[PDB]
Design a protein around this nucleic acid. Structure first.
Lengths: 166, 199, 202, 114, 193
RNA sequence: UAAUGCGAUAAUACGCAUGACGGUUCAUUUUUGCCGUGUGUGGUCACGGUAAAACUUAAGAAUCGUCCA
């Protein structure tokens, strides 16, 4: 079912059709190094629950870690995870980071009533979609990959799994 | 404020990398000639030999000879007539560039083909062919009576009536008639020349 | 050898019932409709056999293998419709659970030309001057495209790195080209292997 | 600022190629049905005609452009056609086409753009 | 008619030079070879006694007249740097093609360049960014620092006294920089290398 | 649509020329996922859509390269 009238089926002005981001199935692109924005966003932009395509695989490494659930992770959480992974694996390990916190979030101080406009930026987050691959590793063995997985699982609110290239 | 450009380097194919895994056998001159003659439509004749490797002097002569046979034996529509015109225009121009490489038989066939075809003659293709064969030694050493018969018939149709050339051909044509080789063409040429002498 | 069962013409929404029973939908492409009756053939393969093949070869490795498919009646296992020679093409797998959803296969006689992405393998990587010094061999392209005949499909490409030092790069020009196959594309001079010490500056 | 389309029963069309200029007159009963071509004259016909009598350089010449216009005028006059509407497109701005149109107007045929 | 209406270089390029380049550098197609497209002559304020980036057009009339004498075709004022400035320009320019281009090259090489003190060779070509048509073109740039060597500025010496220098650019279409050098050598223009 | 197309004097009388190989750009609804509406203890439900987004194997067409296996 599609909610449109007969005149719309024939003379719609929506010539250039784009699928909304909330339900688009295209995989997200690789993170870049652009500076963080100072423009407030809406809360929906930090959440996305649609699953990943049924063709996702590893792109660069031999091992990786994926998320079995959707979640919204802050910048602080990623930094702690990054240090834990670096310390656990080795100095001589190849690491790819496929996620980055880029969506600003606002907050108001204590003692302020409702209204009088939106608040100011406080921190940044990133949405995570089910089945998405978060980290990839190379120049390591499978047992080392499992140790990295167990190290970070207590530090995240979502269930994690191991992915291997074959 | 003027940017500059760097041309990307060329990509040479690596050695020992086959260009194709399909079976494309090599073709010699004899096979190409057989393929050209075994044509039934102008389209097949046009595609019988294309490219600078196969569309050589011998192929151009074969196309003109076969085109004359098809033109006489069949009636064609507008589209096929355009195909025939294209065949003639390309074959003659190739001949005008590689004429010096032609053999005695090819030149004899070329004169016969040009006489039969109704399109305008190219610059001096007939005259150039005559000059190369005017030494009087090639016609005498022409073992195959077919080449001599074609040359004699072609000139008679074109009405050259060269005194020296005909005098040489007369004894050769009579010998061919006695030997029973190329009787139809030899008789036709002799009859036409005899009619010219009477007139 | 894989066992497949015939199916009825049904909608997309009826596929989840086959998986619940324990079978994975499969499609075999590359037939002539004039002489066979269909351009494509729809079947279902037991999940137990499908998982064994993937584990034995791999999600991408199995695409360079030839398999035999036997079509039988689901109600009567002793009724054999026929036999087919095919090669896997692609696999549809859930991202959250890593379970098979759909298998694409190609009808591959012994006298047909097919495009195969062959994996690259290394030999004698431990014995290498670069590894001894402290470097490592980095693979930039796990799979490389080839045009192969049905009777000769390379299971993998064996690249020897026993005599590679630091900063040594192996390009497509240097890859072996077995008999009956040729390299595809024109983007030669592309890095496939690189012996280096960089770890991404992480 | 595209103008609305106006239906006309008789229209004049030109097709300019590398070698020749073609002119056609087509009659229509409705936009949804194919037309019927009533005149079909190109510089190829003019070249074959003039070359026999008066030598011309090539089909795309001023002599042939005037000859094509004259032949078009005769056919329309015989069929009792005196007014046509020209279909404007990229080929309509070709120099050869413009010469033909000018000759037609002088001969007596009324050609309208709108 | 006792007038100069022919072109010596034009005959040389097509009837003499072209075949030689084909033998030296075989190519599949006939048209695939070095070709000289155009020559552009420019005079800017930095090449004149006037010391200002933007000057009025009436001050550049003399230089425009000078180019007309040298080339035989009228020159045009350069476009204004911005819409705000309308009546002020920044130099003059003229472009030549065909027979006129060849005649200018012949006179320059045979008479003027040999009499220029510090001349050794023209610089190497530079490759420009391909346009929408995707054709690669190379440009060779050099300047003439003594414009009073032409025999035409002697009729009115006082009028043409301020004429000092000019810049020249040549556009060439070829498959490689080596082909550009071969064409330049055929034109009898030594290249500095 | 060979009364075609392209061209480096580019104009069109002249030059290349419709085949063959190679590389690019465009069917059991290919069948899976996914989305929408209805109903729902939050899914052992129904129908439709994707010419909006991911995903298969071809065959053909348009340029381009090429003495041709």
């Amino acid at each position: 079912f599609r909610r449109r009238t007969w005149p719309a089926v024939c003379g719609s002005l929506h010539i250039w059709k784009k699928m909304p981001w909330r339900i688009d199935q295209a995989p997200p692109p690789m993170p870049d190094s652009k500076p963080l924005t100072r423009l407030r966003a809406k809360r929906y932009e930090g959440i996305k629950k649609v699953v990943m395509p049924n063709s996702t695989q590893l792109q660069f490494g031999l091992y990786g870690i994926r998320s079995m659930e959707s979640a919204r992770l802050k910048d602080n959480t990623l930094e702690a995870i990054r240090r834990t992974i670096r310390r656990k694996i080795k100095k001589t390990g190849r690491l790819w980071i496929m996620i980055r916190a880029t969506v600003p979030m606002t907050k108001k101080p204590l003692g302020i009533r409702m209204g009088k406009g939106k608040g100011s930026i406080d921190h940044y987050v990133t949405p995570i979609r089910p089945g998405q691959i978060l980290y990839e590793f190379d120049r390591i063995s499978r047992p080392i990959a499992l140790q990295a997985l167990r190290a970070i699982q207590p530090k995240l609110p979502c269930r994690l799994g191991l992915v291997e290239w074959s | 404020i003027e940017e500059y450009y760097v041309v990307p380097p060329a990509c040479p194919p690596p050695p020992h990398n086959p260009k194709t895994l399909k079976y494309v056998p090599k073709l010699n001159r004899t096979q190409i000639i057989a393929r050209v003659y075994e044509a039934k439509t102008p389209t097949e004749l046009e595609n019988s030999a294309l490219g600078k490797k196969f569309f050589s002097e011998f192929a151009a002569v074969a196309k003109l000879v076969r085109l004359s046979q098809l033109r006489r034996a069949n009636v064609y529509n507008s589209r096929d007539d355009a195909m025939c015109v294209s065949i003639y225009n390309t074959s003659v121009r190739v001949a005008d560039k590689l004429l010096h490489l032609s053999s005695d038989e090819e030149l004899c066939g070329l004169i016969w083909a040009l006489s039969q075809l109704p399109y305008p003659e190219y610059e001096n293709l007939v005259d150039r062919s005559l000059q190369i064969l005017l030494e009087e030694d090639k016609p005498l050493k022409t073992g195959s009576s077919l080449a001599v018969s074609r040359a004699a018939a072609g000139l008679a149709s074109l009405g050259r009536w060269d005194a020296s050339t005909w005098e040489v051909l007369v004894p050769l044509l009579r010998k061919n008639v006695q030997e029973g080789k190329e009787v139809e063409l030899s008789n036709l040429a002799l009859g036409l020349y005899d009619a010219r002498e009477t007139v | 050898e894989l066992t497949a069962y015939a199916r009825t013409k049904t909608k997309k929404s009826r596929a989840k019932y086959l998986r619940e029973d324990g079978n994975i939908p499969t499609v075999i492409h590359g037939f002539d409709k004039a002489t066979c009756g269909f351009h494509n053939l729809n079947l279902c393969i037991p999940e137990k056999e499908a998982n064994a093949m993937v584990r034995k070869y791999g999600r991408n490795g199995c695409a360079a293998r030839v398999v035999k498919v036997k079509v039988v009646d689901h109600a009567n296992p002793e009724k054999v419709f026929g036999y087919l020679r095919t090669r896997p093409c692609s696999l549809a797998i859930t991202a959250t659970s890593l379970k098979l959803e759909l298998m694409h296969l190609q009808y591959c006689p012994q006298d047909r030309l097919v495009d195969v992405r062959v994996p690259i393998r290394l030999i004698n990587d431990d014995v290498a001057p670069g590894v001894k010094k402290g470097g490592w061999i980095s693979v930039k392209q796990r799979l490389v495209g080839y045009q192969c005949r049905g009777n000769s499909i390379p299971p993998h490409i064996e690249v020897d790195a026993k005599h590679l030092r630091l900063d040594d790069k192996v390009l497509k020009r240097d890859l072996p080209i077995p008999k009956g196959t040729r390299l595809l594309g024109c983007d030669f001079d592309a890095v496939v292997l690189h012996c280096t010490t960089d770890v991404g500056k992480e | 600022p595209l103008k609305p389309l106006v239906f006309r029963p008789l229209k004049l069309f030109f097709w300019a190629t590398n070698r020749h200029v073609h002119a056609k007159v087509v009659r229509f009963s409705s936009p949804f049905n194919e037309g019927v071509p009533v005149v079909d004259i190109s510089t190829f016909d003019a070249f074959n005609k003039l070359k026999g009598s008066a030598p011309v350089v090539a089909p795309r010449s001023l002599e042939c452009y005037k000859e094509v216009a004259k032949m078009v005028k005769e056919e329309t006059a015989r069929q009792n056609i005196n007014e046509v509407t020209l279909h404007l497109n990229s080929h309509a701005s070709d120099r050869g086409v413009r010469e033909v149109v000018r000759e037609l107007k002088n001969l007596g045929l009324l050609v309208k753009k709108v | 008619s006792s007038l100069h209406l022919t072109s010596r270089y034009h005959h040389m390029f097509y009837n003499v030079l072209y075949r030689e380049m084909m033998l030296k550098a075989p190519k599949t197609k006939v048209e695939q070879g070095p070709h000289l497209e155009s020559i552009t002559l420019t005079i800017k304020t930095t090449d004149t006694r006037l010391d200002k980036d933007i000057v009025d057009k009436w001050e550049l009339l003399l230089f425009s007249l000078a180019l007309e004498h040298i080339t035989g075709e009228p020159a045009a004022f350069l476009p204004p740097p911005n819409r705000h400035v309308a009546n002020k320009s920044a130099g003059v320019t003229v472009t030549l093609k065909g027979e006129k281009m060849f005649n200018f090259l012949e006179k320059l090489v045979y008479t003027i360049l040999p009499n220029q003190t510090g001349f050794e060779g023209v610089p190497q070509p530079k490759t420009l960014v391909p346009g929408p048509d995707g054709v690669v073109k190379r440009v060779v740039d050099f300047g003439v620092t003594n414009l009073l060597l032409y025999p035409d500025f002697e009729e009115h010496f006082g009028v043409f006294e301020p004429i000092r220098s000019m810049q020249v650019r040549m556009m060439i279409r070829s498959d490689s920089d080596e082909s550009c050098n071969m064409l330049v050598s055929g034109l009898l223009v030594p290249q500095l290398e």
